[PDB]
Design a binder for this molecule. Sequence first.
Ligand SMILES: CCCCC/C=C\C\C=C/C=C/C=C/[C@@H]1O[C@H]1CCCC(=O)O
Ligand SMILES: CCCCC/C=C\C\C=C/C=C/C=C/[C@@H]1O[C@H]1CCCC(=O)O
Ligand SMILES: CCCCC/C=C\C\C=C/C=C/C=C/[C@@H]1O[C@H]1CCCC(=O)O
Ligand SMILES: [Zn+2]
Ligand SMILES: [Zn+2]
Ligand SMILES: [Zn+2]
Lengths: 608, 608, 607
Amino acid sequence: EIVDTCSLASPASVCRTKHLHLRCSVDFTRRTLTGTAALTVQSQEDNLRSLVLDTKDLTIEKVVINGQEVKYALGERQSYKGSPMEISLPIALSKNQEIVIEISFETSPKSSALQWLTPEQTSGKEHPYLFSQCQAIHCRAILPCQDTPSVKLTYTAEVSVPKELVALMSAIRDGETPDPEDPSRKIYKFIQKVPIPCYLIALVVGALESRQIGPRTLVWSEKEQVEKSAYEFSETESMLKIAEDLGGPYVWGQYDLLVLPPSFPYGGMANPCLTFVTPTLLAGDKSLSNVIAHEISHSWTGNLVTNKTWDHFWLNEGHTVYLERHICGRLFGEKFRHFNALGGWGELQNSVKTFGETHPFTKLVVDLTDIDPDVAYSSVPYEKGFALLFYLEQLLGGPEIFLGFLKAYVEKFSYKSITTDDWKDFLYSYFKDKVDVLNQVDWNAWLYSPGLPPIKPNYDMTLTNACIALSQRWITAKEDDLNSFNATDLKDLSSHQLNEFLAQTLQRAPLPLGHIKRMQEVYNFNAINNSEIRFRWLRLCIQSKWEDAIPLALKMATEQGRMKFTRPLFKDLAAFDKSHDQAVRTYQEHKASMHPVTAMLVGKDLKV
Amino acid sequence: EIVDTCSLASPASVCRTKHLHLRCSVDFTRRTLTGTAALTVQSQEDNLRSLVLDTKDLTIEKVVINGQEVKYALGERQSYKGSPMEISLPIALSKNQEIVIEISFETSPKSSALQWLTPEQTSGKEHPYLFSQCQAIHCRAILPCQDTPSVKLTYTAEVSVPKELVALMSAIRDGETPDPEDPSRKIYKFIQKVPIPCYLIALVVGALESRQIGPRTLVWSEKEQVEKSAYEFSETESMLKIAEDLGGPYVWGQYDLLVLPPSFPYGGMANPCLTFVTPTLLAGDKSLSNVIAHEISHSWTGNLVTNKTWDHFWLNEGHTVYLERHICGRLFGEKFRHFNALGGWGELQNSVKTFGETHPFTKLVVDLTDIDPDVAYSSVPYEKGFALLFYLEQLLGGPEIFLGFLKAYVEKFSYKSITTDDWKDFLYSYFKDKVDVLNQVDWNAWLYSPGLPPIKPNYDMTLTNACIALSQRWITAKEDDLNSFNATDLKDLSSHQLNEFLAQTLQRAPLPLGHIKRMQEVYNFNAINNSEIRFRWLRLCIQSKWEDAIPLALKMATEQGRMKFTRPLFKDLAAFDKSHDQAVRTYQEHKASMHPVTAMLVGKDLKV
Amino acid sequence: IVDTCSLASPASVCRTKHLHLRCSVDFTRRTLTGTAALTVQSQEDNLRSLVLDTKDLTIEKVVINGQEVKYALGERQSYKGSPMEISLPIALSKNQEIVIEISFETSPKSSALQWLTPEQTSGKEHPYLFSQCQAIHCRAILPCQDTPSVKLTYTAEVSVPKELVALMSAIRDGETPDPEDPSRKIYKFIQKVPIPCYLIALVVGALESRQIGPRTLVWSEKEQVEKSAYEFSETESMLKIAEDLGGPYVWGQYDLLVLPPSFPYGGMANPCLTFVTPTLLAGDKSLSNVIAHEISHSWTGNLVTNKTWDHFWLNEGHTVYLERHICGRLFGEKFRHFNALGGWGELQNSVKTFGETHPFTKLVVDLTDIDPDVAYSSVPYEKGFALLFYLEQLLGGPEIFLGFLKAYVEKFSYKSITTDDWKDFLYSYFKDKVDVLNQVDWNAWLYSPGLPPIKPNYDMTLTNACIALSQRWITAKEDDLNSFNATDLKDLSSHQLNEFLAQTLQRAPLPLGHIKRMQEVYNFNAINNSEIRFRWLRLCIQSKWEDAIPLALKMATEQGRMKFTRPLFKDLAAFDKSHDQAVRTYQEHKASMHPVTAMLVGKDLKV
Ligand SMILES: CCCCC/C=C\C\C=C/C=C/C=C/[C@@H]1O[C@H]1CCCC(=O)O
Ligand SMILES: CCCCC/C=C\C\C=C/C=C/C=C/[C@@H]1O[C@H]1CCCC(=O)O
Ligand SMILES: CCCCC/C=C\C\C=C/C=C/C=C/[C@@H]1O[C@H]1CCCC(=O)O
Ligand SMILES: [Zn+2]
Ligand SMILES: [Zn+2]
Ligand SMILES: [Zn+2]
């Protein structure tokens, strides 16, 4: 009934991959991954004679079944979807019959899933570095697979690397041995016994060291960042404990963190057993830990209960933002949960404004037919999804009651892949005594209409009031008022409130260039290295036509690669007449060394 | 007085679109139409402060009036009717005041008006293909409009396409030029000076070539079908001359023919200046040219005199079938007109039997409140409408007298949209001297009752007798009579009589399996490629439980897409237990690549 | 005699004896859906088909003896609707009966119904529905012989959202949860007295009740229920008087329902459940003559019924006659004459408006090709009353003539009759006074347009002070305006204030300075008595006082009684200063107005 319009492989209704055994070697002299993917596949129908896998820029050497090579054909490339690989089975399979297909392959150096870093691009300057990023549909650029989240497989893996480096994966570490075929190399083994969608497969190889920060958590990075990260993320275990109370047991064994080089495109990636995080989280005061609570929460919403197709991405992210903000509310107070919730509604405003209130990507449930998931990615599924759940919480009796539903929903669909209708049907089942309340929800509008939601939740304003007051003072200030502003204006404002003040002001950009110059004089925002504050501050300066900020904005856009920051900065710099040429030139000069997905999207943003 | 319950736009009594200037670009990479629709709108009332247009899956970037963006709101989607779009006018308009509203829009890849074909889906295999089909209410899935046949507008268009392709529209071709903004593209221009309902807007883009077959007729298709099409439709100009004698002057300038890919859902579509036709008319002997005569006749009944709402659809089709059969009668004789007339009564019997004799869709005048016109569509308005006109012909003095009425009717309502009451009132006015005769008509049953009409016209039987004789012989035959059947049974039967023989036999299906095998043995109907004969033959085989015909019926049902054939073949295959599962699997495997309307209806027929 | 307002088979062909209505009220789609089971009796041999009235109904199927039958919906005949011809399975002989079960659904545009959103009600939480079938709108609810010549009993089962209450023109016969939908409730009703179908009535809404007499509950939304119980406290005393005058009350219950402000009439005497406008809520019981009028229909109209609408005056003339006797008993014969004379004034106004040769000023009208809603006026009420009042005084006074009235009701109870029936019985009851009767100009009274040929005699006691004050204002000049004072009113009842304004309105326009002075000394703006405020605002508008424009527009739209709304809209359209805003206001409100009021105001405003 449900079709994954982003995958070219045979659907789960035809056959299902139950297990992957990956045996590969990481070759830094050629920037390629070579090896074998052994897929244990189960037919779901009688007379299954062939099957199709996803691939993208993969070189296929051979396909072996039962010791014999078999016929296969790579179809024509379908742009961002890659090339379908049809495999002719030696004998037709019947329903429930299993077979192991071993595919020998190597990746392209331009694999959209991988970034290869030269030693000069690392912190240590002596060794190279490799990291993967498979979500949404880049796993097919590492290895042939049914690249759809409707299929969940276990996996084991054997990875040969230069013996001076360390390999980690989204799995439990299963030992290391010198490579018997090459004394300069080492083999690291991994095992993942919880079934996962293949977009949760992850690999990192580099000069990595670790620091233990909890009974089940090591923080990993290059030696220059390991201690700073252990401090920054010291709250991890306390958040895991809260998450388990809200979601039920943590089933993944280990919860390690990996702090990647600055070019990592996202704030985090909840790869099971090994969350990847951006080093732009290292604010020095733990103030960006909500990203950690987010990735922790995916250990339930996303990794355990999984969207069946990317049309239903909001199930993954909406519920994860909801759990994230409950974690931070437990740690810092209910008024802080509402502050962050209200801030999230503002980011939704921004996203709808950027797309347009009729744009299809502002629907909660999207149709990705002929759409690249990376192009459609936005805050909408996060924050319109959260807004729906927060609204339902307030409609159905408050946080305690709704968290009861959330825990039961996770238990109901653990280890499965589901759709919006699965979720809604269960909501109605769990709240069968409040069906008349549920039936007052404008379901069509919430789930399927573009634009802002048909109703806005209620938000405590306690921590937001001071932000609104200071922003309005600046917005409505005249020349005769600029002298009244003083560093003391920020006396009782947390970093979170400074960030919100700037977010509110940015929504009403541009300000008079004289206001921005004063703001720097009395507040010295140029000295703040908190990445969220500096991002919004530099966007404010650029959109308000301050030439002094051009080099600072260019520096931040290129010295880190978190798309949340890099794309809007390049976009603002391109729209500023005095920095347009520099923005395009800087992009062209850096795009070879950028992450492949970020490089593509920035290129698209700049129209080059 | 009359309400169009298929449209959400402001009605013609509130405001009227007088002109459309369409400027758009066709993007085969994204499967989108992007551009601007400039609507010249005339208010019909004082103090008009806003108006509503139909849309369906359109992204509305902005709305500009007098060089300034205006406020607009997209309402909730109402399933098959789309989403209404309310525009707040900058200044209230009084009666007769006109404004130009320029709407920037983008279609969805899932536009129900469009089918996008990949190169592999075309005849040439090297280029992609796009064609539209707006009737009844799909124009709103291409551009914002008052999507109601009660409004008639002229239009001009500018269409940008890849330079390797050709664009055509339901309009006079107005030149081509390289696209100034993109050397990879061309711009084709079009002019329609005759006011049309928006359902007659049509666009095709593909690798099209042409042959001239008359002073005002080019036949268009991919190169592989051009010449065969020019032969098949050589009678076009002679049919236009006859039609002009029956209906008055042809006002549209050009009468071009476009032969579409096999997935075109209808036998023809009478888009002004450019009739669309199915390639299943390519029988090799011109025997299916009544479809051409039908589309030609729409140049008067339908395109010039238009039904005001789709409840009065029979005005379009009943009169068009009436003219169609007069054209073919002029070319091939009055006995042949009666032959086709009687065959059409047979098709009415089939339609009433399928719906049931009390179904509201067997009424001549229908009520489509909350009904999707694509679901209600049937041959009832065609054949009950024709039957009413044929009955009246015979009642009022015969064909020469009634053709005089028809010509005066066309002249009276030319360029207008009308109801059944307008028609009937003018019938009484034209036949002032026969009011007592008209008052004998059972108008209440003819117009508003379901089932077969209250009275059957008189039909010459000359050409039908041999078909009845042979059908009866096969129906009443026993196993010992089978050897007497012989190929010489067919020696004096035309293709039309073969077709009617199968139709009469199909009305009494199933036949014994042994009878059907014998029929193939002596007549070799498997060898016949005439789409009408093959369709009825395979239905007979499937309904008579002949397993050998399963792959043939599945082949025809999927290798072309004319709904007249595809839907009943899938239905028959679904009802045959031996082919049920394969019918369903085949639909599921192809539905992504099917026409959107055909896919929806076959999915409904199959109950998936 | 033919009913030119009905397309159904007439009573001489077949007669509906009983209706069993089983329906469901859908507020989402604004439809009534269900089955109308008609028990029909043939009046002729070889009856093989029959025709029913319908208007904007969707017919799903027609069932007789458990089998679907053939039927045909015919061409629409504008306000008359569409005829529905049913083919009977076997021919019927004289007196044979069949039950015909018709599955139907109403249109949201049904001219019989107004659907109200929650915002349009007092409570704001629940929707509301009410019907109004008189004269020929029952055919827009269900198929029927929509003619008062046919009288039927009925039973009904109505399913509604369980939070709402349903009432009908019938005895309440219990309630129960809907066995097929737990969110709904089924209300049952039984009407054992045969009625013409224009007396079928339905209301559904958030209704509450207060008992104000042994056989009277007053129903409304909670916001109005106690104020209405006070306003109409005289109901039982009026019922007792009406029973003395007309004979027994045969209907069982006499409940009252106070509708939302859009109800188009002052009242509608639906049996067992009189509907009234909330504009009767004056706060002092002063508009209770409307209750007396609806009570009186329990005899003249509901028990003795006009055979066709050409004879509407039989219903309304006698009902006004009874109305004014009830109020005369309660408040004195001088008050009866006061009300009678005012009614003559309203007849004057109506005949002047129509014109003295207008066919709608005949007592007996010919409604061929005429929409009854368009012909409706005060002529049948007040010309009918004037005829009976004249005859009263001609034949020996009220005591004698009330003797005729009681014998007339008894003679024709449960029947439908014509003017000739009434006149023949008059001549029979007054055998000894035939010479007196033969002095009456019957052709003038019954069949000629314009004002009656003779005016009755009226006591002037309560009217004199009204005329004196009005003339003082009409003939006053500048030097007289300062002599007017609030004390001018100290001895005038509300009824006399209203009559003073009516007298003054007849002579409109008055000078603008006069109207300004009148508000200064009398403060008529503060009076909320709807009759008084209506005439006051008409006076202000016709006298060109721009300050009254917002007040008149407010009254015209915040309530919907056609007696007030239509003349306020017409006056506003006749005032150049208010014309545009009046048309604009109507266009902005018409979608939310009652369908009949919307049609008529639209016609009045030539939109
Ligand atoms: C409704 C459209 C569905 C399209 C789904 C398409 C793409 C998803 C691809 C990559 C997602 C990476 C998600 C990472 C953790 O939730 C993200 C928080 C990181 C945001 C940031 O702080 O930069
Ligand atoms: C009684 C009203 C029913 C509602 C249907 C309204 C619109 C129907 C929608 C699309 C109609 C396309 C008609 C095309 C040419 O006249 C048709 C002949 C082609 C039929 C065939 O041979 O496949
Ligand atoms: C002389 C025949 C003309 C055709 C008129 C026949 C029927 C008109 C249709 C509806 C009549 C409803 C009457 C209701 C109550 O007796 C009326 C008192 C209410 C008037 C008011 O005070 O607003
Ligand atoms: Zn996430
Ligand atoms: Zn046609
Ligand atoms: Zn009355």
